[PDB]
């Protein structure tokens, strides 16, 4: 019932640069382990976990909030945003896998209840040129009901590509654009106003996460819904964002914002402020699982399903979840419903 | 004058628990070195420096802002506050020691000019009971014009001790109280109203750095000036602190908030908002030096002079600065005016 | 070295009225000189310099901020805006030429670092009628990527001319309109809404610099980005402009707003408020140089390149900077990289 | 009746440094002259008048607002505050002396009507130590009902002197304190709270004219009424001061803010905002006269009566006004009721 060993692992591989992820395993005196993930710079997150590890060993895993508050009280002064929050999120997601196992229930049921047993996720596909059209047509064939494309190659370059992908997918499939704060307010509305004709479901991270007044103005000047919050941490950060009427959709990453415990608190806030929540997910199947269980408990929904090459997701992590013809099905298995192939873990670790 | 090797060093020391601070040495192709420091969890900052090190090598040190913006562009999605900011701060302070050396001028002169050639710092002395009175009497005897005491032992316990220290130091010496966000709004005004009679120069971090409305209310309900910002990072963070009329004095830590480059930008903002700036300093002389040079360029001033038991500061780092009868004299030496005893560095290092 | 002699010179020439500009030369004990410029009424600025000259002689030029603060402390009650600010600006730009020379580095590197080694400036061309089309076609042929035209001849007269210039330059070249506060809110949106179809990059000084609510409303009712701040002085003035969400682009004139020192502080503020900065430039190459070095340090960019008939700029001032096919290249020479032909200086002057 | 010659004169005199003030004489084709004054740096104001002089010659003096608007249209881009406003003020006050003479009526009657035929001004007396007490006792003996003292020598030094002057003058005479923005918010309330016991009628310029939030806060934390606006220029400047609920009393200087025309417009605004107006006066009798006529038309009042050593005020300018036992009597003579001794003018002139 008590924590015996927290074990952070930095997993990597280069494809065509490198993908460096930090992954934890918290195991109890009884052998009951739990899998969690942190989002950001792998090796920095890994040291973060090491920082909290002394104050978590021999303490009870069911009262996960008592541990979250200990980690918070310890890092408050040196955290707020960034790295130590990804360290707290990584431990949290594992304590929710433990609890799920421990109380023999999935995480969604343990968060309050499965509100959506089926989810329809969107396919993410970032960038010659005609290859993007093929990647999109693959997703439509793969049953997907929506797809998220990466923009930031230039206002006139993007509008040329957005036109091409919309022509391929037709009008029935949903399409979203993601800048990655690669544009400024003037550059964002120029793209927004011009891309409106292609029925864009939303615009993800259009300006700097620091440009709150820019987000609000963009929302006022375009019909396309405004997404943001990848870079937003804790209940306090998202309150600050919602008080500014910035986004139509809040996108906290479970692995970054403060884990399942805090993204649930952010979900309460989103609700009160009457703002939609679609979490951000860009890691292994441990990361994806936490989102599966969160959107199930959220009140057909969508979630981020990275279709990009990644053997740290497909090979290192083992999911029980089922996806056929754009629809994903929430698992009933205790905890997140994930494991790590310890041979593929050792093969893909870092030096 | 390109960067050839960035070298982060975690140095440990237990007295009566442990004091673990991270430090950097950036050395150019020409063997010009510069010393820097990060504030927060040593081993986490140390990995942070390692994160930016690949994109800093083979780049010119004089154009320090080009490097700051590269580090920012790289961490803007996974930082905003905490750990990666103290990694950016640490590199910055060392690039200012390099520039100082390189152009054969002190940092203050290189920040714009020595406005205050003499500064009068305050003595910090945290916690049987009668020992606190002796530590204070020592500081008054040592020439100090002001002293900062730590509070959070209970409203009635603090008021008992604040009365004792004021009785010892008399009326001529300034005295400040520091909660360390160990109090809530109701607990803070209870102490503030009760401690008003013992002439308190300021109340440092009275409530949570997240409780902006609490700071503002406390400022409205007490005569004692309100200090805060230890836990505030970047120009964007201090703009939101100032927009909410929270503090009378803003206290950014150079080694945490974004280095000398950003604390200077925070100084421009503080100026525009007509709010005083006294930086936070709690490290080695690499950290103290950066503050010496910053308050010199700021427009008799004070700064944080840690007077606690610290061999890591007093032994590993070598300062040139002179202090006699409460007054500190800004050095004219190129750069920060600091060096590291490489034998005491090897002796005090962490495994 | 210390300041031995500040020398203001009012220079003029009538072409087809007169252009009366004031310039300064600050000369050190060691004969190190620095060239500066003030923007506004020459003879009034010239007396301004004379006002500060007594309190600047025998003082050190490297600690330029110590001098800026002396000039400020002296003229704060009788300044805030206008004439004495252009007096402080003129001295500042020359102390930055001195420092550049003194420390053997260009101004941009000395402001923090060259962020943009290449800039693409815009051609200014103010006003029968068919002559304007030829002036524009000349700029397009001269490789310019953008051109700024003067408007204020009447809503229907301007829309007639804007149509003509856009027809000549085609769709690939950028085009901006400048009212010179010659329009009121009702007259401004009438032009804005009608001129949109001609792809206008921005609208410069659309209403009175005093009509902040007019600027905000115009921004809300038109797609064309709103420029302004020519007439704005100091960090306090620009804070006041940004607090009211007036402009998309802030245009401080280095030679008017408070020199390189203050336009840099305005640049920190613009950054915090997430508003673009394109400085205003309308003088000699002393003025153009200061902007070259400022936009280089700012984070392809543009700047104001006056392409009208002016011999005080082309004959009295000597530049090192290179311009070939719309692109300008930041110089590496110590200081601004400018000199004054003292024979042409004596030739163009005032009794 | 057109303007034939505008003549600015810079008059200098050293006592125990120099007092350099600029004065104007506008004379019509018919030999009707009018005397004016500008407040600030004499030689800078003198060049300002020279700037507008070309666009004022051969134009009618009764339609003074047509001239004010011409000067404004010309200066707005390079003025807003300071020097060019004091040039516009100087011309304005002389056009009001002309109009007064021209229509054979005093200025107060020509501003709308004498509301107060008798006004009780205050004696200004800035700074061994015991000499201040004697200067105050002289004023009480001279009949004065109120006196304004200069503060900024240090919080404990001022409280020592304020106590001394109050002891001498007794309880019946009013007493006001003037910082001259020599204090910051923390330093201002320290002085305000401590000086409350000495019945202070008002606190003039307590913080920087730029620290609007400081003024507002000080007003909230002290019982002593807050004065300010010396450094405020135009109707636009005073609207922004009043919008922020800064002052209890607005103090525009006629010779600086925009002359009698603008201080009257500022008076309309002050009225609408329900804020008192006591103008700032620190020049010759040309300046004092303009205030006599303005407070007469304002709706027993007070005004600034400089009682220091001033040979330019008492020798160069000739007044008709009468003062006996603290009460001043508004003159009925056409215009301001002032002349200049042309021999003492030629004597005190500058090179
Ligand atoms: Mg995204
Ligand atoms: Mg502290
Ligand atoms: Mg313009």
Residue numbers in the entry:
A (entry chain F), B (entry chain D), C (entry chain G), D (entry chain A): 1 to 16, 27 to 137, 144 to 315, 325 to 376
In the authors' words:
The resulting 3,6-anhydro-d-galactonate is converted to 2-keto-3-deoxy-d-galactonate by ZGAL_3156, as measured through the thiobarbituric acid (TBA) assay. ZGAL_3156 did not demonstrate any activity on D-AnG alone and is thus a 3,6-anhydro-d-galactonate cycloisomerase (dauB). The crystal structure reveals an octamer, not uncommon in the enolase superfamily. A size-exclusion column analysis confirmed that ZGAL_3156 constitutes an octamer in solution. In the enolase superfamily, the active site is located at the interface of the two domains, the lid domain shielding the catalytic machinery from bulk solvent. Two disordered regions (17–26 and 138–143) were not modeled. They are close spatially and constitute the tip of the lid domain. The residues involved in the coordination of the catalytic cation (Asp194, Glu220, and Glu246) and the predicted general base (Lys166) and acid (His296) of AtGCI are strictly conserved between AtGCI and ZGAL_3156 and have similar spatial orientations. This cation was modeled as an Mg2+ in ZGAL_3156 and as a Ca2+ in AtGCI. The residues shaping the substrate-binding pocket in AtGCI originate from the TIM-barrel and the lid domain of one monomer and from the loop between helices α2 and α3 of the neighboring monomer.
Carrageenans, alongside agars, are the main cell wall polysaccharides of red macroalgae and play vital roles in the development and physiology of these photosynthetic eukaryotes. In marine ecosystems carrageenans constitute a huge biomass and thus a precious carbon source for marine heterotrophic bacteria (MHB). The marine Bacteroidetes Zobellia galactanivorans DsijT, originally isolated from a healthy red macroalga, is a bacterial model for the bioconversion of algal polysaccharides. Here we describe in Z. galactanivorans the discovery and the integrative characterization of the complete pathway for utilization of the kappa family carrageenans (containing 3,6-anhydro-d-galactose units, mainly kappa-, iota- and beta-carrageenans), which is carried out by a complex regulon including a dedicated atypical PUL, lacking the susCD-like pair, and carrageenan-induced loner genes including distal susCD-like pairs.
